[PDB]
Amino acid sequence: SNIIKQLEQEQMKQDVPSFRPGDTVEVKVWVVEGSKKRLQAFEGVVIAIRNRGLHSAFTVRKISNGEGVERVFQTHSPVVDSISVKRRGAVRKAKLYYLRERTGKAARIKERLN
Amino acid sequence: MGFKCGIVGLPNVGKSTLFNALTKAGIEAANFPFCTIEPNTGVVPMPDPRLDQLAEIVKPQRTLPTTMEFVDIAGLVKGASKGEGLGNQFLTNIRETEAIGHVVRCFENDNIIAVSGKVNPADDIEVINTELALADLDTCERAIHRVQKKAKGGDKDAKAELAVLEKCLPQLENAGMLRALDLSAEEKAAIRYLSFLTLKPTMYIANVNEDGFENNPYLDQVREIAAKEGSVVVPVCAAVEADIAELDDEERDEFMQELGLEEPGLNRVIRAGYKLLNLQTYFTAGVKEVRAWTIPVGATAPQAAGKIHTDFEKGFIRAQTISFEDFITYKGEQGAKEAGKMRAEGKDYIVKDGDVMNFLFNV
Amino acid sequence: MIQEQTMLNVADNSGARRVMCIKVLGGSHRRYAGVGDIIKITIKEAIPRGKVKKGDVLKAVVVRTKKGVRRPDGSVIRFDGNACVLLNNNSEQPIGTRIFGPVTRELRSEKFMKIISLAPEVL
RNA sequence: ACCGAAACUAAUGUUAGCGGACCGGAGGCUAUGUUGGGCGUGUAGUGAGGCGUAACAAAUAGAGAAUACCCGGGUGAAGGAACUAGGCAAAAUGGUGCCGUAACUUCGGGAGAAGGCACGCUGAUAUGUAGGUGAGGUCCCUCGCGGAUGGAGCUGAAAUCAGUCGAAGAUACCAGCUGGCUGCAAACGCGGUAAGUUCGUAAUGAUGGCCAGGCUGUCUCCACCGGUAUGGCUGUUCGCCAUUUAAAGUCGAGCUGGGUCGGUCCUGCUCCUGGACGCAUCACUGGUGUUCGGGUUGUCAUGGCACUGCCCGGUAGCUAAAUGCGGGUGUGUAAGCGCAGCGAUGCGUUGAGCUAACCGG
Ligand SMILES: [Mg+2]
Ligand SMILES: [Mg+2]
Ligand SMILES: [Mg+2]
Ligand SMILES: [Mg+2]
Ligand SMILES: [Mg+2]
Ligand SMILES: [Mg+2]
Ligand SMILES: [Mg+2]
Ligand SMILES: [Mg+2]
Ligand SMILES: [Mg+2]
Ligand SMILES: [Mg+2]
Ligand SMILES: [Mg+2]
Ligand SMILES: [Mg+2]
Ligand SMILES: [Mg+2]
Ligand SMILES: [Mg+2]
Ligand SMILES: [Mg+2]
Ligand SMILES: [Mg+2]
Ligand SMILES: [Mg+2]
Ligand SMILES: [Mg+2]
Ligand SMILES: [Mg+2]
Ligand SMILES: [Mg+2]
Ligand SMILES: [Mg+2]
Ligand SMILES: [Mg+2]
Ligand SMILES: [Mg+2]
Ligand SMILES: [Mg+2]
Ligand SMILES: [Mg+2]
Ligand SMILES: [Mg+2]
Ligand SMILES: [Mg+2]
Ligand SMILES: [Mg+2]
Ligand SMILES: [Mg+2]
Ligand SMILES: [Mg+2]
Numbered sequence: 001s002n003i004i005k006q007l008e009q010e011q012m013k014q015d016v017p018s019f020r021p022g023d024t025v026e027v028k029v030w031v032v033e034g035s036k037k038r039l040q041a042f043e044g045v046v047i048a049i050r051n052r053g054l055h056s057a058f059t060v061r062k063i064s065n066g067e068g069v070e071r072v073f074q075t076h077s078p079v080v081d082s083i084s085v086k087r088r089g090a091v092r093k094a095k096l097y098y099l100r101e102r103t104g105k106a107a108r109i110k111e112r113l114n
Numbered sequence: 115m116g117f118k119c120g121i122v123g124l125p126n127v128g129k130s131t132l133f134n135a136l137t138k139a140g141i142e143a144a145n146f147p148f149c150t151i152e153p154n155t156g157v158v159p160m161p162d163p164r165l166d167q168l169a170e171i172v173k174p175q176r177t178l179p180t181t182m183e184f185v186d187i188a189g190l191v192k193g194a195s196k197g198e199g200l201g202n203q204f205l206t207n208i209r210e211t212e213a214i215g216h217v218v219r220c221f222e223n224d225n226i227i228a229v230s231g232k233v234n235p236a237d238d239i240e241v242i243n244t245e246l247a248l249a250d251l252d253t254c255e256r257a258i259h260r261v262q263k264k265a266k267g268g269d270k271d272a273k274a275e276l277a278v279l280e281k282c283l284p285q286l287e288n289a290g291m292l293r294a295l296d297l298s299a300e301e302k303a304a305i306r307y308l309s310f311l312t313l314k315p316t317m318y319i320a321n322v323n324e325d326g327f328e329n330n331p332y333l334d335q336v337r338e339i340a341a342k343e344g345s346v347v348v349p350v351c352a353a354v355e356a357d358i359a360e361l362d363d364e365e366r367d368e369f370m371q372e373l374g375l376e377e378p379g380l381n382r383v384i385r386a387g388y389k390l391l392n393l394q395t396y397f398t399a400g401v402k403e404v405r406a407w408t409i410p411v412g413a414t415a416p417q418a419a420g421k422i423h424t425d426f427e428k429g430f431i432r433a434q435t436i437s438f439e440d441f442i443t444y445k446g447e448q449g450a451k452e453a454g455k456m457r458a459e460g461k462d463y464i465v466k467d468g469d470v471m472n473f474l475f476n477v
Numbered sequence: 478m479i480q481e482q483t484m485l486n487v488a489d490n491s492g493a494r495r496v497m498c499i500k501v502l503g504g505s506h507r508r509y510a511g512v513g514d515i516i517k518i519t520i521k522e523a524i525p526r527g528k529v530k531k532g533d534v535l536k537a538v539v540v541r542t543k544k545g546v547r548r549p550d551g552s553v554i555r556f557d558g559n560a561c562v563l564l565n566n567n568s569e570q571p572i573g574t575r576i577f578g579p580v581t582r583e584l585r586s587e588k589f590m591k592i593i594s595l596a597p598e599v600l
Numbered sequence: 601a602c603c604g605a606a607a608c609u610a611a612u613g614u615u616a617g618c619g620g621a622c623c624g625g626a627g628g629c630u631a632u633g634u635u636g637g638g639c640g641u642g643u644a645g646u647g648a649g650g651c652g653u654a655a656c657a658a659a660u661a662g663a664g665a666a667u668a669c670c671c672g673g674g675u676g677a678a679g680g681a682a683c684u685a686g687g688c689a690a691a692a693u694g695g696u697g698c699c700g701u702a703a704c705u706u707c708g709g710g711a712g713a714a715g716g717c718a719c720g721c722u723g724a725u726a727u728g729u730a731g732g733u734g735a736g737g738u739c740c741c742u743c744g745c746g747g748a749u750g751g752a753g754c755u756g757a758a759a760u761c762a763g764u765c766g767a768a769g770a771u772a773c774c775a776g777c778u779g780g781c782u783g784c785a786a787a788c789g790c791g792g793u794a795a796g797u798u799c800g801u802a803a804u805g806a807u808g809g810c811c812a813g814g815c816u817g818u819c820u821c822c823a824c825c826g827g828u829a830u831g832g833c834u835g836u837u838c839g840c841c842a843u844u845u846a847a848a849g850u851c852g853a854g855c856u857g858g859g860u861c862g863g864u865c866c867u868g869c870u871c872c873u874g875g876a877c878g879c880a881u882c883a884c885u886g887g888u889g890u891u892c893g894g895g896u897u898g899u900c901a902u903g904g905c906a907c908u909g910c911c912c913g914g915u916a917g918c919u920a921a922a923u924g925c926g927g928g929u930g931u932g933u934a935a936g937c938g939c940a941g942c943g944a945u946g947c948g949u950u951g952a953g954c955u956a957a958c959c960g961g
Contacts, residue, residue, distance in 0.1 A: 068557030504875030
């Protein structure tokens with residue numbers, strides 16, 4: 001609907017960078033402790049992107065402290081301070097869920113050199 | 115060989131004065147056999163109440179305390195871990211040691227100026243750990259390159275090695291420490307020979323003001339990180355340790371009584387390095403000399419005796435090993451024999467710390 | 478989203494290697510336990526010389542779940558496996574002295590600030 | 601003897617499994633296929649066949665007469681047997697080669713024990729190799745349906761190295777679950793669990809009991825196409841036990857069929873916000889999504905078929921575990937052309953092409 005489109009559009013972030021599944025990205029999020037508020041960095045491979053305007057989300061998977069962690073960020077939420085693509089990956093799927101079965105060597109993603 | 119903990123850290127943090135006063139704690143090698151002092155090889159002795167408490171009864175002619183060994187890891191630039199000559203030298207100097215002591219400046223001083231200008235233990239710690247982590251990343255990547263082709267050959271041992279290495283790799287890629295992983299004992303066994311740098315235990319040598327031993331935000335952050343990584347800490351003051359190095363016995367006693375210190379923090383660094391590596395010391399009683407002998411924890415009586423002399427190992431038959439409590443409370447060897455608290459220890463029993471022992475061999 | 482019979486890995490050095498949830502505490506017919514919930518566990522695997530034995534019954538706090546936790550903005554954080562930190566059955570304090578792997582901010586209550594302080598990374 | 605084509609279980613009222621063993625198995629020869637272009641004689645071995653009156657293979661892929669092509673199913677978050685009398689059913693395993701294989705043993709076995717690795721395609725070795733077949737020509741000859749040589753041509757593994765594509769190479773269909781303890785029966789010889797009502801003998805068993813790994817919609821709890829426990833044991837009600845809780849107060853023309861070895865049916869907690877339940881919803885997180893896109897195996901003619909063939913994603917809708925009380929989306933760079941490469945293939949055009957139920961007209 002035009003009404004909901006306008007309501008969502010006036011909320012969408014304007015500076016969302018272009019990234020693709022397989023890209024390694026670093027997502028700077030806001031952590032609020034007590035009253036202070038600081039940046040926490042979540043760097044990992046983008047394994048899934050949901051594109052729905054204001055409801056766009058993307059999944060970032062990392063291996064933190066020997067344990068696989070997937071975080072699903074809401075692209076336009078204020079808690080996500082920034083997104084920076086640290087490496088462009090060359091994959092062919094839109095959703096890289098198969099990396100959930102991969103370990104180390106088999107988990108390398110070729111660098112999209114272009 | 116000595117059980118060695120390399121002292122690493124960023125420049126302008128107070129490490130220089132620290133290991134200078136540590137070397138000043140070292141004894142002149144003119145009386146100790148086989149003790150050769152390289153300028154950075156710091157062999158330091160044990161202030162041990164137990165040995166003098168033994169000597170109060172056994173009354174030996176001389177005393178031979180055991181000593182530990184230290185490496186000053188000097189010369190450092192950012193980005194050294196990319197294979198630069200100084201970076202390779204730093205990494206090699208760390209590699210040959212057995213533990214890491216990381217020094218952290220925890221005292222505000224505008225006359226001691228750093229490259230950051232801002233006093234922050236967290237980011238300095240992170241910088242040096244990232245350096246070692248990139249070094250271990252290079253080593254580990256070489257390791258999987260070597261081992262994956264073998265494990266594809268059906269070698270189960272190389273398979274397990276591969277599993278441990280693959281679990282280690284993303285930590286190093288994430289610039290993370292292998293000591294932050296839950297690695298079982300056999301995984302440690304599998305990757306012991308690769309000598310992973312981040313894997314060795316570390317002691318956080320926190321250089322602080324004399325009055326700043328508590329209520330210190332820098333100490334707070336150092337304690338927080340050491341708790342997270344399961345590493346131990348030791349707060350020291352460069353000025354206080356330097357003075358202790360610069361003072362003789364009675365004036366040193368006066369200075370330590372002035373500051374309210376029950377015993378100096380150099381002793382704390384000694385104990386931290388000693389107990390960090392899971393090693394202990396026993397005592398041999400004699401009229402000539404009562405000597406404290408350093409072994410790894412769990413080394414047998416034959417193995418400890420071979421550490422003395424190989425005939426004491428190969429020919430070993432039995433030892434009369436006495437617990438230190440029963441040795442002291444009965445006032446010496448003869449009281450021990452009168453109480454029957456001896457142990458006719460064979461070859462399989464594991465040596466306990468501080469046990470008064472007599473060694474019997476046959477060669 | 479842990480229930481009875483769920484097998485969790487252990488996120489501390491207490492010696493337990495795998496535990497099993499035998500009860501979800503804190504409510505009649507309560508189905509599940511998410512991160513920050515106390516469960517009653519038995520120990521299915523332990524290292525031979527650990528602080529706890531195979532077959533002991535004690536408590537645990539779930540710190541990582543595959544199902545994950547939601548954040549107020551709608552984010553979700555999911556882990557590859559379910560993990561718990563063993564707790565003294567009475568004091569409900571951690572039995573280990575180190576924590577392995579990341580945890581989440583839902584533990585940051587006065588109950589579990591020890592775990593937060595020992596955790597390698599709080600998400 | 602073993603595996604496997606040509607009445608043990610469950611569901612329905614045959615189907616899927618099981619035991620023994622759109623259909624299209626409904627040496628020499630030949631049928632026949634693939635690719636290329638009666639009489640006479642009396643042969644290999646009385647006697648096929650041949651000859652007279654092209655080669656090869658040999659009784660699409662595949663070992664094959666299997667298989668595929670010429671309520672009944674699919675998927676499922678987290679968990680993973682908590683279901684239940686009982687893992688019933690389902691899920692799972694599943695091929696070949698190589699390595700490796702325990703107790704015990706009647707020395708055969710156990711055993712395919714278990715467990716591990718590799719697998720596609722392309723190129724090279726080698727313009728098709730080893731091997732098989734074998735023309736011409738040459739020579740011999742008791743001279744023929746002969747012998748030797750010779751290798752043309754045809755067929756042709758298997759392996760190594762290198763490259764290369766996918767998420768996945770035994771890609772589909774097809775195709776062992778495995779292990780431990782024990783009763784009985786073949787001949788033969790003489791503690792475990794948090795909690796547990798459950799004469800020997802290798803092999804064998806649709807045999808009884810128990811345990812474990814894997815696996816799972818069996819279940820929590822199903823989805824899509826006023827309140828008033830959970831479990832272990834047992835047929836149990838009960839009971840004990842484990843652990844919770846505020847509390848565990850004092851019906852088979854609905855199902856099952858275990859009993860009668862086998863046997864027709866509202867409030868907690870914290871400090872000085874939760875549990876359970878109910879309603880609504882789909883914005884978020886997800887499931888489904890046989891109507892969208894893609895990958896891929898076999899085959900037949902990009903499409904059909906193979907469970908949607910197998911899969912990977914996924915729109916709307918529905919939904920709970922979720923949360924209140926022209927464009928967009930999805931897939932993922934179409935086709936064609938061009939370039940590189942010997943080729944598989946890669947790259948450019950190109951985030952292309954296509955895009956359901958959506959949104960705006
Ligand atoms: Mg037979
Ligand atoms: Mg019958
Ligand atoms: Mg019926
Ligand atoms: Mg049948
Ligand atoms: Mg049979
Ligand atoms: Mg058969
Ligand atoms: Mg023919
Ligand atoms: Mg057929
Ligand atoms: Mg199914
Ligand atoms: Mg499921
Ligand atoms: Mg699942
Ligand atoms: Mg499981
Ligand atoms: Mg049961
Ligand atoms: Mg039940
Ligand atoms: Mg069955
Ligand atoms: Mg099945
Ligand atoms: Mg019986
Ligand atoms: Mg029989
Ligand atoms: Mg059971
Ligand atoms: Mg009993
Ligand atoms: Mg039910
Ligand atoms: Mg009955
Ligand atoms: Mg009926
Ligand atoms: Mg919607
Ligand atoms: Mg989805
Ligand atoms: Mg689907
Ligand atoms: Mg057809
Ligand atoms: Mg069809
Ligand atoms: Mg057909
Ligand atoms: Mg296409």
